[PDB]
């Protein structure tokens, strides 16, 4: 077995391999998540439409379980590995506890795996950051973020990937009880946040909503265009 | 010519011209000992004469030897690094034992040479270990081929020979033998010892004395490997 | 030994996996392989690179490989690694048919291989596989599907895609020539010759220099057929006639 | 051993003032057959400890080699420390229990007699790891024929001399020859004292009376 | 960079890691061994670095078996490790074949373990050379020395350490083949005292061991009385 | 240069710099003194406080009723060796029902500490230990080194400014054999003091004492229990 | 243990130089030729010894794998001996399961798999040998080449080793699809002769032939006859 | 070039010394031990208003009588806090007793330095843990506070500050700490020193405080109780 230490401390106490992983996340597409009162919204920038590419195969928003779903920025191949591990985990949890995993339970597991790959021999940190969003059994909307370092925090709204700082600055000044009262207002907040980074507008923006006690819904391109016009 | 790129000359990997310098440096180790070995086959005999250098009068000379018995009927002359040599003598002795236990007959000298050369090749393909710096010249009597002199090298190359030499004066010995064998071969007869003794004597300009050389011999009449005593070696040296 | 290790599975100061990027450069020097999805079927058109006169034709195809009874793939990159990945693809398909007794869905087969490819890019200390594959197939969930995978372990479904030499130029021409929803295997087997006639700058398509395979559903059975050289020659002839007519 | 093969019979032991004495017959039986009639089932572990064994003789031959090396290993260190008679008894209890727990027992009941620090040691070890120390020991049929007699004498006179101990051992060996069908009339007597362990050669209870 | 691993030959056919390992043995005090007709006597110049050290600390004469003794030079930690290997090889030989191991076989088997540390980069060559000596009625007296490379040869008188060459001149002026152990012990002490350099090496404790007909084929430390007579003869001879 | 980053690389002068480096760690630890009489072996340790509001650290440890250890170097490596020593002593009292000879334990530590010095990817142990034990051979003081070499000592000092102590010990070593426990303990305390930053004294807070003898199981005297020994200097 | 990291890796231009260097060793090997005729395949190799002190009948370059499959090579003979053993063991594993001689194409694929492993495994170098495998199966002659990379090719005629490019040009102008093994043996000797330098003799060259009867190595005496004409 | 376990010419281990620098970049955490209990305070260091301050957990409970304050790479701590919690429950299952704080600190400090790449284990750690821990609890010995560092060294501290402003809070701590200080006075002293070092303005949402008291269990102060103390601060 290859057992070299890929992730090692550097003078000044910096794990450069973890910092290089975050540079890959910064090269990723922008993913935005706003936690509303009865709706959690996740929207991703469809970089290039490609035109000759089936979109169903390049979706960056997935469902780990019936109550949880996640968006990612960074390497798509590393993400597929993390999503599959979290999907298997949610089912193993339902079998050993007979209850749906909590949003933070799965966020904790995804982070703990992303961390062990930063302190295990023969492995490179995962170059992906995720936005785990769901609804706890109590019905509380939940939004968490994971870093390639294994660090996770809960947020009211966040942005990952290219132009995260710009989008998060926008959400910092445009997030309020007002822009969250209506499910449509929550959706248009994510749309406007991405439109700050997305140049095409509407055509290059995937979006998904998970209302309480309901499966993840992928808004159709026409529905997205409706809000994009109303938000103009 | 000698282009290098990477650890071409530190580990066993191909040079820009596919050369494997590490094996080439393992052939320079064989000549670091300073001794030369000569093996000649005759009509019914195979002889292995080697140069014996007991540097100190405090060293027991009975322990300073390069001739070895792999099996009662297979003999070996080792040239190069002494510790690497004793390692291959042991692997040969074990492979010969495992052979009789699994097949029920003594191993042919060609088959012992191929096994040792196959193990040597693995040191040329793996980078965790250095090749062994030693050459083994094996001699035996095949039931259907008679006298057999085989040599394996640090690269994994093995071949059968009418007469061979290994060590510092390998080239000069080769030429000496590559003229007698051409005329009428190492004059076939247990006195084929004279060709070997004279080859080593001529190349290493020296009139050997009974104690300055070691001679091992296998014959169709007496197939068992035998190390000649100073008196027997003296008889041949006095004869010439 | 840390001195002789190349550290293939590590990041770069800019969050880049260079072994994967270098392998992708290798793929861009291999024979052009184009895939076009039509309403009646899917097609793979590769550029033959073994075109010496003393070569014997002893196989069904050099670049196209059947992995299932309903799936086939073409490869661009290192042939040795493609033989390894094609054998693994065939086992994954057989292992699924054993567990469920149904043919494997196409994207499920591509994901399995891409999971293996991605693992060589994160751990192990070994080089990645320098092979990008174009997969064509039919399933009872999405029907005729074309997919492309990379040494990174990243796959994607496409309506028309190219991999190999002059691949970018091909994707450009396919982009301006592919009519989504209005493509018949005839118009698909026509745009293939057009793209190959531009990607393969080496003279004009010579039939011996190209390989064309089609996957179609005939009476509830998926049929993969490598067009015979006679058929390919007729296609190249029609393209020449059409171009001349427009002149 | 799940099935004992060539076995030895009873081994006796008695501590006296100045050391201990062990006695065993020189016979190995193959199920009723006196097959090997010149074997020693007594061993000098070191200068202060002796060991007598009943049961499988190949299992005893294994212990003689393992304990023999254990002593050679210690005497190569030159540290000034040595295995005491009690330490050898502790190791044998640990060894017999370890094997019994693995369900692969050494079919052997051993009597360990020693002398160190002006103290006499006499310890018993069975194949199941049962071990104890006592003024007298009798394995096999000596547990029913010899121990009763030794215990009677060691009750009235708690401390015996070397002359008394040897006399009682030779008397118990005669009763074992008269009533043990797996016994033999050739025996060895080993004595551990401040001079070390001494083993006496083929002795005979030939002092047998047959008024029939 | 051809001298950083034992898995690398130089462009000249030399493994410099093993040559560097033997430089460590040449930086150690000398240990001399002389074979006579009665057996073998080992002698070591044990330099005492600290006066706060008990007598017998860092001993360089070991008992590898009832009949075999080991003199050592170079790293004592590596030497103690090879004494454990020699002790284990002798133990397994007695358990498998059922007799005292011949010193040639013990030497050959230990030399092979040493040579196994001269072929890979995962391990470093041992930094110690040792002399194994024994005496049996069937084999007689035997003296073998093993080097960091793993070469084993039998000698009539060997010397490992910083003064090996000077010690060898003195040992070569002796008729060991005709002398007896009782007479050799004084000569070993004389040579160790003559090779010792007080100006540089401060002070030393002469360590003496022997195996022979007198010890009945048992390696042992020369009796204190015999060692003291030897040291008195040694100092008197230096005069 | 390229001969001082691995323990499997001999320098051109026959020296492993990594063992020399690990041996520097012990010289970078609080001084610890150890001396033996004819009946007692005492270990005096100069505990060092990280801050004015921090306990010293605990430099003296128990291995078995007959053995105790004073530490110098990496405390984590010291705990790892202390556990190996504690188990080896438990194993001896479980199999032979006898206290493990102190000399034999030191042999085992030198064998365990030598292996990591000849294997690629492994580091020498960075702890120097002063072992004090009583046995059928009397009181014993031993010093172990990161190089895997050990020494039977009449008295020893390992740590920072420990040469000052070794100077005192070498001068007074002649009288230690025939000494009472308090005279012996005070001799050790005096030497540990000779290793103190000029303007500093041996308070009950900065000193620890471990003792073992014919009738005394290894005891670690700390805090007020050191007051009896300190009072009288 | 051993190194678990690949010694063969991708260069910035997307090339594995270690395999390129192994192909340099194959091009510095002694000349080898293979010709697939309509009734069999001839494998001929230049076997020139350094001196008259070598037993030419001791070690062979043309070697049988099964009874219908035979191999020749150009490169490092020690590495070739490893691949000959593996080819024979793979050929026997096939017979033990399907109880039929292994198809020559199946053997070339299985051997090429082992060769590719030495280009992606850890601590090992690629095999510095290119192999020419000839086999008779299903009443058809087969000639395949195997590169150090693990890539296999089917040929009608091919040359390897020193002067392989000029040899392939000669074979291109001489090879005729309608040929017999006897005519093929002559052209193979002529191809080696073009790049021999000396007098080709029954012992300076080694030839092996595969036909419906099976694979065999032409005896020095049989080769003596061919060299005469 | 150098592997994880290479000693410096000063014999210090580079990976352990770079992990200590990693802590100097963490949020300041202060721990004070009084007779009436132990107080643990930490700086949340919130980055954005959109973050949920509750998600930042720098003070955790190992058991009802033991709490822990972390500073440095927080993700690294998760595995260390998991070992502490399992070791405490294992001690309960085996001996039916609460584990002492020194025994919990010793069990976790043992996992540090257990790293390497020489096939040390299948799931062996590759590098040291870049975290410093302040364990505070109440055993049979009373309120106790221990500090553990990435070197595997643990110490009993009456008052200790770990993090970025330790080289300043410790000076302030050594100027306001008295053995007789009450828990309330200690709690106020922690917040005052934290408010000084903290870059942001200390509020009831940007700091975390918890206390272990002889009778009461580990208690994390809620905004209401924090606001009361911050009012006096």
Nearest to H146 by CA among H154, H138, H60: H154
Residue B181 corresponds to which tokens in the numbers above? 């064998």
Query: Over the Cα atoms of chain A, what is R_g?
Result: 18
> SS3 for D193?
strand
Say what the resolution is, in angstroms. Answer: 2.7
Q: What angle do CA G130, G136, G139 make, to 5 degrees?
A: 145
> SS3 for C32?
coil
Residues with Cβ within 8 Å of C172's Cβ and at least 6 positions away in sequence, in order, are none
What is each CA distance from E19 to A91, E144, F13, F120, in whole angstroms?
A: 62, 20, 10, 19
Q: How far apart are CA F71 and CA F126, in angstroms?
A: 11
Residues with Cβ within 8 Å of H3's Cβ and at least 6 positions away in sequence, in order, are A5, C2, F5, F6, F121, H116, H117, H118
Would you say residue G224 lies in a domain?
Answer: yes
Nearest to F24 by CA among F158, F156, F141: F158
How would CATH label the architecture of H14-232?
4-Layer Sandwich (3.60)
Q: H/E element holding D192?
A: strand D186-193
Tell me the DSSP string of H169-181. Answer: HHHHHTTT--TT-
Q: Is G112 on the interface with C (CB under 8 A)?
A: yes
Tell me the DSSP string of chain F. Answer: --SSS-TT---TTS--HHHHHHHHHHTTS--EEEEE-SSEEEEEEE---SSTTB-----EEEEETTEEEEEEE-HHHHHHHHHHHHHHHHHHHHHTSSPPPHHHHHHHHHHHHHGGGSBTT-----EEEEEEEEETTEEEEEEE-TTS-EEEESEEEESTTHHHHHHHHHHHHHHHSS--HHHHHHHHHHHHHTTS-SS----SSSEEEEEEESS---EEEEGGGGHHHHS--
- Exp. method: cryo-EM
Number of H helices, E strands in chain B: 6, 10
Nearest to C46 by CA among C79, C19, C84: C79
β-bridge partners, D83: none
Chains that touch D (3 or more CB pairs under 8 A): E, F
Active-site choice (D1, D109, D193, D207): D1
Q: How far apart are CA E73 and CA E80, in angstroms?
A: 11
Residues with Cβ within 8 Å of B236's Cβ and at least 6 positions away in sequence, in order, are B191, B193, B194, B197, B215, B228
Residues with Cβ within 8 Å of G30's Cβ and at least 6 positions away in sequence, in order, are G45, G46, G47, G48, G61, G74, G161, G162
Q: What is the DSSP letter of A186?
A: H
Nearest to G41 by CA among G151, G167, G122, G145: G145
> Which residues of chain C have a Cβ shorter than 8 Å from any chain A Cβ?
2, 5, 7, 9-16, 107, 111, 114-115, 117-119, 121-126, 142, 145, 147, 152-161, 171, 174-175, 178, 180
Q: How far apart are CA F89 and CA B135, in angstroms?
A: 51
Nearest to F186 by CA among F139, F231, F223, F141: F231
Residue A94 near residue A145 (C-beta atoms within 8 A): no
D1 is catalytic: yes
Tell me the DSSP string of A157-177. Answer: EEEESTTHHHHHHHHHHH-SS
Residue D138 near residue D150 (C-beta atoms within 8 A): yes
Q: Is D118 on the interface with E (CB under 8 A)?
A: no
Q: How far apart are CA H131 and CA G201, in angstroms?
A: 78
β-bridge partners, A53: C158
Nearest to C231 by CA among C216, C204, C243, C213: C213
Query: Which region holds residue E216: left if phi is over 0, alpha if psi is between -120 and 50, else beta?
Result: left
- Which residues in chain A are closer than 8 Å to H78, comparing Cβ atoms? 112, 115, 150
Helices (H), chain D: 57-74, 85-101, 142-145, 147-156, 162-179
Q: Is C100 on the interface with B (CB under 8 A)?
A: no
> SS3 for C86?
helix
Pairing of strands H154-156, H142-148: antiparallel
Breaks (C-N over 2.5 A) in chain F follow: none
Find the CATH number of the domain harbouring G69. Answer: 3.60.20.10
Residue G20 corresponds to which tokens in the numbers above? 């390129």
The number of distinct structural domains making up chain G is 1
Domain range for A95 is: 9-231
Residue C20 near residue C118 (C-beta atoms within 8 A): no
Q: What is the DSSP letter of E101?
A: P
Helix, strand, coil percentages in chain C from 3-state DSSP, rounded to 5: 35, 25, 40
Length reported for chain G: 229
Residue D8 CA to its chain's centroid (Å):
11
- Which residues in chain G are closer than 8 Å to B156, comparing Cβ atoms? 76, 78-79, 81
Length reported for chain A: 232
Tell me whether residues F13 and E121 touch, CB distance under 8 A.
no
What is each CA distance from C237 to C185, C197, C205, D128, E192, in whole angstroms?
A: 17, 12, 9, 94, 100
Would you say residue G64 lies in a domain?
Answer: yes
β-bridge partners, A197: none
β-bridge partners, G137: G140
Find the CATH number of the domain harbouring C167. Answer: 3.60.20.10
Q: How far apart are CA F195 and CA F46, in angstroms?
A: 9
Q: How far apart are CA B124 and CA G77, in angstroms?
A: 12
Helix, strand, coil percentages in chain H from 3-state DSSP, rounded to 5: 35, 25, 40
Tell me how crowded residue G64 is: count the other CB atoms within 10 A of its CB.
20
Packed helices C185-199 and C229-245: angle between N→C axes, nearest 10 degrees: 80
The beta strands (E) that lie in chain B are given as 36-41, 45-51, 67-71, 74-80, 134-142, 146-152, 158-161, 163-167, 213-219, 226-227
Tell me how crowded residue F166 is: count the other CB atoms within 10 A of its CB.
23
Q: What angle do CA G197, G199, G200 make, to 5 degrees?
A: 95
Domain range for C179 is: 18-246
Residues with Cβ within 8 Å of E31's Cβ and at least 6 positions away in sequence, in order, are E42, E43, E44, E45, E60, E71, E72, E73, E131, E159, E160, E161
Q: What is the DSSP letter of A180?
A: G
Q: What is the DSSP letter of B31?
A: T
Residue F65 near residue F215 (C-beta atoms within 8 A): no
Sign of CA dihedral B61, B64, B70, B76: negative
Residue D19 corresponds to which tokens in the numbers above? 């050391």
Residue H207 near residue H191 (C-beta atoms within 8 A): yes
Sign of CA dihedral H169, H170, H174, H178: positive
- Which residues in chain B are closer than 8 Å to C3, comparing Cβ atoms? 7
What is each CA distance from H214 to C192, F141, H33, H104, in whole angstroms?
A: 82, 43, 12, 18
Would you say residue A3 lies in a domain?
Answer: no
Tell me how crowded residue F158 is: count the other CB atoms within 10 A of its CB.
27
Pick from C23, C55, C124: which is nearest to G155 by CB?
C55
Q: How far apart are CA C155 and CA C134, in angstroms?
A: 10
Chains that touch E (3 or more CB pairs under 8 A): B, C, D, F
Residue G128 CA to its chain's centroid (Å):
13
Residue H184 CA to its chain's centroid (Å):
20
Tell me the DSSP string of H58-96. Answer: -EEEEETTEEEEEEE-HHHHHHHHHHHHHHHHHHHHHHS
Query: Which region holds residue A51: left if phi is over 0, alpha if psi is between -120 and 50, else beta?
Result: left
Q: Is E8 on the interface with C (CB under 8 A)?
A: no
The number of distinct structural domains making up chain A is 1
Q: What angle do CA H48, H49, H52 make, to 5 degrees?
A: 95
- Which residues in chain D are closer than 8 Å to F98, comparing Cβ atoms? 84, 86-87, 90
Tell me whether residues A5 and H56 touch, CB distance under 8 A.
no
Residue C160 near residue C146 (C-beta atoms within 8 A): yes
Q: How far apart are CA A64 and CA B202, in angstroms?
A: 85
SS3 track for H94-143: HHCCCCCHHHHHHHHHCCCCCECCCCCCCCCECCCCCEEEEEEEEECCEE
The beta strands (E) that lie in C111-247 are given as 131-139, 143-149, 155-158, 160-163, 210-217, 222-226
Nearest to G188 by CA among G140, G146, G216, G226: G226
Q: How far apart are CA E70 and CA E79, in angstroms?
A: 9
Would you say residue C69 lies in a domain?
Answer: yes
Nearest to B70 by CA among B3, B4, B148, B182: B148
Residue C82 near residue C89 (C-beta atoms within 8 A): no
Q: What angle do CA A132, A138, A142 make, to 5 degrees?
A: 20
Q: Is C4 on the interface with B (CB under 8 A)?
A: yes
Q: How far apart are CA G82 and CA G73, in angstroms?
A: 12
Residue A81 corresponds to which tokens in the numbers above? 């590995």
Phi, psi torsion values for G216, nearest 5 degrees: -160, 160
Tell me whether residues A77 and C114 touch, CB distance under 8 A.
yes
Residue G29 near residue B17 (C-beta atoms within 8 A): no
Residues with Cβ within 8 Å of A52's Cβ and at least 6 positions away in sequence, in order, are C158, C159, C160, C161, C171, C174, C175, C178, C180
Length reported for chain E: 239
Residue B86 corresponds to which tokens in the numbers above? 């004793």
**Which residue reads 């057999």 in tokens?**
B148
Nearest to G49 by CA among B159, H40, D203, F194: B159
Q: How far apart are CA A69 and CA A106, in angstroms?
A: 10
What is the residue extent of each domain of chain F? 1-233
Residue B129 corresponds to which tokens in the numbers above? 């270990």
Q: How far apart are CA C132 and CA C154, in angstroms?
A: 10
Helix, strand, coil percentages in chain D from 3-state DSSP, rounded to 5: 30, 35, 35
The number of distinct structural domains making up chain C is 1
Pick from G1, G22, G58: which is nearest to B159 by CB?
G58
Nearest to A6 by CA among C8, H6, H151, H22: C8
Q: Is E171 on the interface with B (CB under 8 A)?
A: yes
Q: What angle do CA G48, G54, G55 make, to 5 degrees?
A: 100
Would you say residue A146 lies in a domain?
Answer: yes
Work out the burial of residue G228: count CB atoms within 10 Å of its CB; fewer than 13 is exposed, 13-18 middle, 19 or more buried. exposed
Q: How many CA atoms lie within 13 A of D188 on its CB side?
A: 22
**Which residue reads 């510790």 in tokens?**
B83
């Amino acid at each position: 077995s290859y057992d070299r230490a890929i992730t090692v401390f550097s003078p000044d106490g910096h794990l450069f391999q973890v910092e290089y992983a975050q540079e890959a996340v910064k090269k990723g597409s922008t993913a935005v998540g706003v936690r509303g009162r009865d709706i959690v919204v996740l929207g991703v920038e469809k970089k290039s439409v490609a035109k000759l590419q089936d979109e169903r195969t390049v979706r960056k928003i997935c469902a780990l379980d019936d109550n949880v779903c996640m968006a990612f920025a960074g390497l798509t191949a590393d993400a597929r590995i993390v999503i599959n591990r979290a999907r298997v985990e949610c089912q193993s949890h339902r079998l050993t506890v007979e209850d749906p995993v909590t949003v933070e339970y799965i966020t904790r597991y995804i982070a703990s795996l992303k961390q062990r790959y930063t302190q295990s021999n023969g492995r490179r940190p995962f170059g992906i950051s995720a936005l785990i969003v769901g609804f706890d059994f109590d019905g509380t909307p939940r939004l968490y973020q994971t870093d390639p370092s294994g660090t996770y925090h809960a947020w009211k709204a966040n942005a990952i990937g290219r132009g995260a700082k710009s989008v998060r600055e926008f959400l910092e000044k445009n997030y309020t009880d007002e822009a969250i009262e209506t499910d449509d207002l929550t959706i248009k907040l994510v749309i406007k946040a991405l439109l700050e980074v997305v140049q095409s507008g509407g055509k290059n923006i995937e979006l998904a909503v998970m209302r309480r006690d309901q499966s993840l819904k992928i808004l159709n391109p026409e529905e997205i265009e409706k809000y994009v016009a109303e938000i103009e | 010519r000698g282009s290098s790129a990477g650890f071409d000359r530190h580990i066993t990997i191909f040079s820009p011209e596919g050369r494997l310098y590490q094996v080439e440096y393992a052939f320079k180790a064989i000549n670091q000992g300073g001794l030369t070995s000569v093996a000649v086959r005759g009509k019914d005999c195979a002889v292995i004469v080697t140069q014996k250098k007991v540097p100190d009068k405090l060293l027991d000379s009975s322990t300073v030897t390069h001739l070895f018995k792999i099996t009662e009927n297979i003999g070996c002359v080792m040239t190069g690094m002494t510790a690497d040599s004793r390692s291959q003598v042991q692997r040969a002795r074990y492979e010969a034992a495992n052979w009789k236990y699994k097949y029920g007959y003594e191993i042919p000298v060609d088959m012992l040479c191929k096994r040792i050369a196959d193990i040597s090749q693995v040191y040329t393909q793996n980078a965790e270990m250095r090749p062994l710096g030693c050459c083994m010249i094996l001699i035996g009597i095949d039931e259907e081929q008679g006298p057999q002199v085989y040599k394996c090298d640090p690269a994994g190359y093995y071949c059968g020979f009418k007469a061979t030499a290994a060590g510092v004066k390998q080239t000069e010995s080769t030429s000496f033998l590559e003229k007698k064998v051409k005329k009428k071969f190492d004059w076939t007869f247990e006195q084929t010892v004279e060709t070997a003794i004279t080859c080593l004597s001529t190349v290493l300009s020296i009139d050997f004395k009974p104690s300055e050389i070691e001679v091992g011999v296998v014959t169709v009449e007496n197939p068992k490997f035998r190390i000649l005593t100073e008196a027997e070696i003296d008889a041949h040296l006095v004869a010439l | 030994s840390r001195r002789y290790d190349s550290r293939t599975t590590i990041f770069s100061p800019e969050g880049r996996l260079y072994q994967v990027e270098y392998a992708m450069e290798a793929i861009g020097h291999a024979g052009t392989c184009l895939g076009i999805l039509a309403n009646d079927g899917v097609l793979l058109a590769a550029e033959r690179r073994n075109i010496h006169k003393l070569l014997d034709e002893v196989f069904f195809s050099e670049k196209i490989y059947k992995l299932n009874e309903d799936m086939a793939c073409s490869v661009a990159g290192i042939t040795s690694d493609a033989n390894v990945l094609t054998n693994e693809l065939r086992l994954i398909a057989q292992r699924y048919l054993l567990q469920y007794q149904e043919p494997i869905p196409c994207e499920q087969l591509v994901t399995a291989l891409c999971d293996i490819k991605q693992a060589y890019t994160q751990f192990g200390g070994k080089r990645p596989f320098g092979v990008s594959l174009l997969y064509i197939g039919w399933d009872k969930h999405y029907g005729f599907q074309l997919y492309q995978s990379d040494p990174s372990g990243n796959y994607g479904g496409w309506k028309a895609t190219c991999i190999g030499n002059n691949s970018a130029a091909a994707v450009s021409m396919l982009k301006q020539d592919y009519k989504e929803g209005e493509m018949t295997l005839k118009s698909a087997l026509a745009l293939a010759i057009k793209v190959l006639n531009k990607t393969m700058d080496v003279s004009k398509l010579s039939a011996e220099k190209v390989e064309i395979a089609t996957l179609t559903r005939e009476n509830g059975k998926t049929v993969i057929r490598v067009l015979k050289q006679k058929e390919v020659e007729q296609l190249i002839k029609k393209h020449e006639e059409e171009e001349a007519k427009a002149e | 051993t799940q099935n004992p093969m060539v076995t030895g019979t009873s081994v006796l032991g008695v501590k006296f003032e100045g050391g201990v004495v062990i006695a065993a017959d020189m016979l190995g039986s193959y199920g009723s057959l006196a097959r090997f009639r010149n074997i020693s089932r007594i061993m000098r572990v070191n200068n202060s400890t002796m060991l007598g064994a009943s049961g499988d003789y190949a299992d005893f031959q294994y212990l003689k080699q393992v304990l023999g090396q254990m002593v050679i290993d210690e005497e190569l260190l030159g540290d000034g420390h040595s295995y005491s008679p009690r330490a050898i008894h502790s190791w044998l209890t640990r060894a017999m229990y370890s094997r019994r727990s693995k369900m692969n027992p050494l079919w052997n009941t051993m009597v360990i007699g020693g002398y160190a620090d002006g103290e006499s040691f006499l310890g018993y070890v069975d194949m199941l790891g049962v071990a104890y120390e006592a003024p007298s020991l009798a394995t096999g049929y000596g547990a029913y024929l010899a121990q009763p007699l030794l215990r009677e004498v060691l009750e009235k006179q708690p401390v015996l001399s070397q002359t008394e101990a040897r006399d009682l051992v030779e008397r118990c060996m005669r009763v074992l020859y008269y009533r043990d069908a797996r016994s033999y009339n050739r025996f060895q007597i080993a004595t551990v004292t401040e001079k070390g362990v001494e083993i006496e050669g083929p002795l005979s209870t030939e002092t047998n009376w047959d008024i029939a | 960079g051809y001298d950083l691993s034992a898995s690398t030959f130089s462009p000249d056919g030399r493994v410099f890691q093993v040559e560097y390992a033997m430089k460590a043995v040449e930086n150690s005090s000398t240990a001399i061994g002389i074979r006579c007709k009665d057996g073998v006597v080992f002698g070591v110049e044990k330099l005492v670095l600290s006066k706060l050290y008990e007598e017998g600390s860092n001993k360089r004469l070991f008992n590898v078996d009832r009949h075999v003794g080991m003199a050592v030079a170079g790293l004592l930690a590596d030497a103690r490790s090879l004494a454990d290997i020699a002790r284990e090889e002798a133990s397994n030989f007695r358990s498998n074949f059922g007799y005292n191991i011949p010193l040639k076989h013990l030497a050959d088997r230990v030399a092979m373990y040493v040579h196994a540390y001269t072929l890979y980069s995962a391990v470093r060559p041992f930094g110690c050379s040792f002399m194994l000596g024994s005496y049996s009625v069937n084999d007689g007296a035997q003296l073998y020395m093993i080097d960091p490379s793993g070469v084993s040869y039998g000698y009539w008188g060997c010397a490992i350490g910083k003064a090996r060459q000077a010690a060898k001149t003195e040992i070569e002026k002796l008729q060991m083949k005709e002398m007896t152990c009782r007479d050799i012990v004084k000569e070993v002490a004389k040579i160790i005292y003559i090779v010792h350099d007080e100006v540089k090496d401060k002070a030393f404790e002469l360590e003496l061991s022997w195996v022979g007909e007198l010890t009945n084929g048992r390696h042992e430390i020369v009796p204190k009385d015999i060692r003291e007579e030897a040291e008195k003869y040694a100092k008197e001879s230096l005069k | 240069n390229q001969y001082d980053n691995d323990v499997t690389v001999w320098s051109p002068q026959g020296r492993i710099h990594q063992i020399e480096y690990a041996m520097e760690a012990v010289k970078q630890g609080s001084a610890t003194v150890g001396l033996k009489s004819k009946t007692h072996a005492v270990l005096v340790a100069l505990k060092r406080a990280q801050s004015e509001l921090a306990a010293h650290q605990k430099k003296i440890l128990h291995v078995d009723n007959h053995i105790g250890i004073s530490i110098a170097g990496l405390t984590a490596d010291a705990r790892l060796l202390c556990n190996f020593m504690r188990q080896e002593c438990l194993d001896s009292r479980f199999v032979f029902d006898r206290p493990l000879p102190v000399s034999r334990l030191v042999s085992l530590i030198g064998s365990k500490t030598q292996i990591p010095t000849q294997r690629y990817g492994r580091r020498p142990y960075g702890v120097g230990l002063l072992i004090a034990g009583y046995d059928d051979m009397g009181p014993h003081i031993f010093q172990t080194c990161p190089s895997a070499n050990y020494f039977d000592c009449r008295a020893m000092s390992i740590g920072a400014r420990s040469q000052s102590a070794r100077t005192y010990l070498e001068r007074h070593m002649s009288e230690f054999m025939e000494c009472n426990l308090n005279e012996l303990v005070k001799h050790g305390l005096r030497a540990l003091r000779e290793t103190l930053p000029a303007e500093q004294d041996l308070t009950t807070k900065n000193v620890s004492i471990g003792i073992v003898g014919k009738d005394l199981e290894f005891t670690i005297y700390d805090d007020d229990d050191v007051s009896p020994f300190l009072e009288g200097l | 243990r051993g190194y678990s990291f690949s010694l063969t890796t991708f260069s910035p231009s997307g090339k594995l130089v270690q395999i390129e260097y192994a192909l340099a060793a194959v091009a510095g090997g002694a000349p080898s030729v293979g010709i697939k005729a309509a009734n069999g395949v001839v494998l001929a190799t230049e076997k020139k010894q350094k001196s008259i002190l070598y037993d030419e009948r001791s070690v062979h370059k043309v070697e049988p794998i099964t009874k219908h499959i035979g191999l020749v090579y150009s490169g490092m003979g020690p590495d070739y001996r490893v691949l000959v053993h593996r080819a024979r063991k793979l050929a026997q594993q096939y017979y033990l399961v399907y109880q039929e001689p292994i198809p020559t194409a199946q053997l070339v694929q299985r051997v090429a798999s082992v060769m590719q492993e030495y280009t992606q495994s850890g601590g090992v170098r690629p095999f510095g040998v290119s192999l020419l495998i000839c086999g008779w199966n299903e009443g058809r002659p087969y000639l395949f080449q195997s590169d150090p990379s693990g890539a296999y090719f089917a040929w009608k005629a091919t040359a390897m080793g020193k002067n392989y490019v000029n040899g392939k040009t000669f074979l291109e102008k001489r090879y005729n699809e309608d040929l017999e093994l006897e005519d093929a043996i002559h052209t193979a000797i002529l191809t080696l002769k073009e790049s021999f330098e000396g007098q080709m003799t029954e012992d300076n060259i080694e030839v092996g032939i595969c036909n419906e009867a099976g694979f065999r190595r032409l005896t020095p005496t049989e080769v003596k006859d061919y060299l005469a004409a | 070039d150098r592997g994880v376990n290479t000693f410096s010419p000063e014999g210090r281990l580079f990976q352990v010394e770079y992990a200590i620098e990693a802590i100097k970049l963490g949020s300041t955490a202060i721990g004070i031990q009084t007779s009436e209990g132990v107080c643990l305070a930490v700086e949340k260091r919130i980055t954005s208003p959109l973050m949920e301050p509750s998600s930042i957990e720098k003070i955790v409970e190992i058991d009802a009588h033991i709490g822990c304050a972390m500073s440095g790479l927080i993700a690294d701590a998760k595995t260390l806090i998991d070992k502490a919690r399992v070791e405490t429950q294992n001690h309960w299952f085996t001996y039916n007793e609460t584990m002492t704080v020194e025994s919990v600190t010793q069990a976790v400090s043992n996992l540090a330095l257990q790293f390497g790449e020489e096939d040390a284990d299948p799931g062996a750690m590759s590098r040291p843990f870049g975290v410093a821990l302040l364990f505070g609890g109440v055993d049979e010995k009373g309120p106790q506070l221990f500090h553990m560092d990435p070197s595997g060294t643990f110490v009993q501290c009456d008052a200790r500050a770990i993090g970025s402003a330790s080289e300043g809070a410790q000076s302030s701590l050594q100027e306001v700490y008295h053995k007789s200080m009450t828990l309330k006075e200690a709690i106020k002293s922690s917040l005052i020193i934290l408010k000084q070092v903290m870059e942001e303005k200390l509020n009831a949402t940007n700091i975390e405080l918890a206390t272990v008291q002889p009778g009461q269990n580990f208690h994390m102060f809620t905004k209401e109780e924090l606001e009361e103390v911050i009012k006096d601060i």
